[PDB]
Amino acid sequence: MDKKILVVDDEKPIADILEFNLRKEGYEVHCAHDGNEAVEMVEELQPDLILLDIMLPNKDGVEVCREVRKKYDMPIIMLTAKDSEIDKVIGLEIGADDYVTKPFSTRELLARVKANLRRQ
C-alpha cells in the first residue's frame, strides 16, 4: 500500500517534476490543476497528503485548504514563493500543516512529505 499523494498545482512544469520525483520515491501520485478538480479528487481518492499551491486560480490555495478541512484531516503542505512571509504563515493559520518554498530541492520535498505523513 503506497502512500497516496495529491499534487494540486496549475504550473504543469512544477506539477510534473513533483509527480516525477514522488513516484520515483515510491508514492502513488495524482495531479489536479484547479481547486474544484482538487476538492473533487480529494473525496473520491482520499489522499494521505496534499501538496497545494497557494496561488491557484485566485487565492484558491487558501480556499481549497479551507474547504477540504471542512471534512478531511489529512496533511496539507502549501507550496509558496520564497519572498513572501505572509504566504508561508497564512496556510498554517487556516488548517495546512506545513509549507515548502520554491524553488525547493528534491531532498527537501521528500523530507517534508515524509515528516508530515508521520507527524505525531
Are 88 and 101 contacting, i.e. CB atoms less than 8 angstroms apart? yes
Q: What is the experimental method?
A: X-ray
One-character DSSP codes across the chain: -PPEEEEE-S-HHHHHHHHHHHHHTT-EEEEESSHHHHHHHHHTT--SEEEEETTSTTTHHHHHHHHHHTT--S-EEEEEESS-HHHHHHHHHTT--EEEEES--HHHHHHHHHHHHT--
Resolution (A): 2.0
Q: What is the CA radius of gyration of the chain?
A: 13
The owner of cell 514563493 is 81
Go through the chain and tell me how many residues it has.
Answer: 120
Furthest C-alpha separation in the chain: 37
The domains of the chain, with CATH numbers, are 1-120 (3.40.50.2300)
Is residue 102 a contact partner of residue 80, using CB atoms and an 8 Å limit?
yes
Cell triple for 76:
496539507
Give which of 119, 81, 113, 115 is closest to 5, Cα–Cα: 113
